[PDB]
Amino acid sequence: AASTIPISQWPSLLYAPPSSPANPAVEALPEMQFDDLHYPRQMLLCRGAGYSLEQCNRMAQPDARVTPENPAEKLLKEEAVAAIACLSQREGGKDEQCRYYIERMYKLANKE
């Protein structure tokens, strides 16, 4: 059923992957970013402005141009906190002990 993906189809595989029990956001895969040039560029700009290494290191800040945050963390806050409480109390939800909260979250997120 799962047939081989040739090498020519890998660029399409990266941005339209097959279905899994744990899929990513295919619509947001073009939005995942992490700049390895952020701090070097910052340092170059500051040293061109005229600062010393200590001043540059004090002014350095981490990149804001990274992958956006999951909106579920702000929308389903209380539900997620309750689920985490249930997991911490019931040993990770063994034998279906956090099914209540997990099903409420799933329904809220999916809507049939």
């Binding site: 059923a1 799962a2 047939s3 081989t4 993906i5 090498i7 020519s8 890998w10 660029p11 595989l13 990266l14 941005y15 992957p17 097959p18 899994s20 895969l29 073009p30 939005e31 995942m32 970013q33 992490f34 700049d35």
Partner: protein
Amino acid sequence: SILGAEAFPELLSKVPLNPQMDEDKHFNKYKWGNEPIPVNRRTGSRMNSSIYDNRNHEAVRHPWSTDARTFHPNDNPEADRINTQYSNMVSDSFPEGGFSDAPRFSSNWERLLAYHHGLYSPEKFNSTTKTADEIRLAVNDFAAKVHADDPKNACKYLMIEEFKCLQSAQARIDPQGAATKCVKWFNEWRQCAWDQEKMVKGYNYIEDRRARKHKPYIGAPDLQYS
């Protein structure tokens, strides 16, 4: 005082990180078992590929001594390849840990000379495969930089596509193999460049009158093309 007590939940709870670990430690938590990745696909050396090469399917020769056992791609794969992710697909054409052809130089001048003559880049020889996430990050950064360079460019996505294909084909370690895949997008970009220039600078030509037998049959439709 034991070392790493809280650090092996995979061992305490019988959780396998992969079907190979499952098979080894006999956790038996993978319903479909494990087909082991053979050693010729787990490691090996770079080889020649083309049939128009005389030393085809032979290991690449370097100035240094190197194991001549080659990486063998999966040529007769099984029908069901349950994991069709990039992680499992890349193993059919490259080894995840990189090739076994890397040098340990006894001196710096050997390294210098190999580089000067075009026979060594650590990018190529001391390196692993790139993960899908890394590839996507690189591609998205390049696309952002190109969009900033010029939004109103028609060859934009073609350039982005050749970059994407090089990254996916692991051009750091197989540049010749990746160029073989990506030169099509380079050619399309080359075409788009002229197609854009001729639109910017109005360039056209005198078309001749219609041919007597433009249509093969009188009852045939002559679909009009710009």
